[PDB]
């Protein structure tokens, strides 16, 4: 038992991480087979970043302008191209450590592991959710661009995120691995803000089920509610609407615990209206919304 | 305030 | 910016993890050079675990009773011995993936990364602190014994924890890598309880400094306090005493922020006496105590 | 209640 924010083991991604330098700008790239993927703003100078024209900036580079370092081995660049907001740098050596992998784009509300990197070197691993407003609440410092986010299924790494930038509020924005941004953000050092965020309701319910599975039952009650009456409360507290598909997804956890989804919604209603009166759930004094139903089942069941 | 690209 | 609970990249440990089976009992072992280290209770049957005599149980085994599997390769056991609560299984093959490593014992209040494993296969990675009562608040299911905890410095893995068991309250207990338990626990399925716990004061202060570094300043105030008067408040709220060595360790963070340690203690006093009146710090509505000053400097500074 | 050794 116990319930912790848990990342996937990172070894398979660590063996893909390289350092990419253009001129005086450096960041991380992802080396799969004979291609290195990195944020395109590696080709910016500091004064290029307020209003870059990337197509112009790239036309003025050639292969020998990109220094790629895999450990203390330089990889020779033999081709380059732009794809949306990432660069594809063809190198002369296929990565011998390339895992089975997929490029997937995730939905808001879904989670993934971030391998934070600097200078091509992995620094730490943590778990993130894609917020409803398409930002992520990460931990990233200058030099971390090109760090990736991923999920692992069997021995297959599904890459879903590459890091680009930090917004003024301290949240983070990036692209999928085809270089398309999550959310209405651009890779420019301009005034930009995220849309209003909302709380991920199905995830809060999943975490409440994790809590019961771990023996925190104090917030439970004999009341039930209707989906309609619950969603009226959710909208008032800036929670996303709960769908019948969410109720279905929570099915297995509702079965395991014997607590009907709409019964658990009655608990969430009371917590929203009255708070926790000084108690905690799974060590938190706030309602947590960055665990998916899959994350709960995974951890409260043990898939290695 | 402005966004920051996080190369170095 | 941003501040997250962050584990070390786990690749170097993943390549050491194996599965160890004795009879009908199986768990994980740690394969370094030609030795596999695992919890000694792998030699128990289910009915052996209430009151095992381990020296008797081990005398009745020989090398061929231990099945060690590294992926889908069996490793032949050629020697075995007991050291405190772990077993050392000599195998015929040195692990080609053995990292530079150290066996260190940590102090209460210190943190480490856990690579949770089942059947020799890594499942997830998370960060833990050693509690003042020598337990850890982990996430562990049956089969997770032999998973290890570690810190990484340069390319050297300092192993500090091997997992053994779960106490009745749902917290976890284990040994250092010489097989000596942390705390007054034994590897028996008996009634056992942890001593009363306390909150790690220097860590709470470190996390408050992380908060200021990330722009949460609402709890700051123009007051200061004396070490003596602060420690009177700490004892009342079950916080550990703050030493002058703690003040010293917090030096760099106090310099970076310009907030004197005893000034920050005046904030902590007020938070302890009045709570947060519905606000949060670094996304938490509770005072967090599982980040060391090193963890804060590491993340709010970026060592890869 | 009793401690649980977490082999399987």
Numbering used by the authors:
A (entry chain A), C (entry chain A): 1 to 304
B (entry chain B), D (entry chain B): 118 to 125
Question: Mind quoting what the paper says about this structure?
Answer:
We used 12-mer peptides, P6-P6’ (with the scissile bond between P1 and P1'), in our co-crystal structures. The binding mode of the C-terminal residues (prime side) was more varied, especially beyond P3’ position, and lacked full electron density.
The SARS-CoV-2 translates its genome into polyproteins that must be cleaved to release individual proteins essential for replication of the virus.
